[PDB]
């Protein structure tokens, strides 16, 4: 029921972004909001059609990276992950972008201890998005049913940012 950008160019999507907004019903993020920063997030083709995901972030005095692969999923935009940790499946949506400043992501568990989870993403070709593209994700997720208390724009950075 998740909708996918219509006509979605994953050539367009690659590339640097960073995460800018989120918004999600899990316990240990809403836990940890305050501490939650930007991150870096570099889009790459896989070798299976789909996407590598490398994401980079300040966490407690380190900076840490973290690598998803998605898969495509039966349309472009629609995509699968599977955490080889906990064997959990995702799907992942590149809901709306316009390619060359910013791209909505929805996240929604399917199968296994992460089904419940649901996640939307503002990605950012800039670390500074204007209020437009802010009162954009607000938007979608507040029509995704995501409460003002679980919304954060990611504050900006210079930790584990560079290349």
């Given amino acids: 029921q998740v909708s996918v950008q219509p006509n979605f160019q994953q050539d367009k999507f690659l590339g640097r972004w960073f995460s800018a907004g989120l918004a999600s019903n899990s316990s240990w993020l809403r836990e940890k909001k305050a501490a939650l920063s930007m991150a870096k997030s570099v889009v790459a083709p896989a070798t299976d059609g789909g996407l590598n995901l490398t994401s980079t972030f300040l966490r407690k005095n380190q900076c840490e990276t973290r690598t998803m ?67 954009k994700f607000t938007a979608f997720c507040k029509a995704q049913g995501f409460t003002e208390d679980t919304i954060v724009f990611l504050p900006q950075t210079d930790k584990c940012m560079t290349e």
Avoid: I, N
Wanted: proline residues 6%; without cysteine.
């Fill in 69 to 135: 692969l998605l898969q495509p999923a039966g349309s472009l935009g629609s995509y699968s992950y599977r955490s080889p940790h906990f064997g959990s499946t995702y799907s992942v949506s590149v809901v709306e972008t316009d390619y060359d400043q910013y791209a909505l992501l929805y996240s929604q568990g399917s199968k296994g201890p992460g089904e419940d989870f649901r996640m939307a993403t503002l990605y950012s070709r800039t670390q500074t998005p204007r209020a437009e593209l802010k009162e």
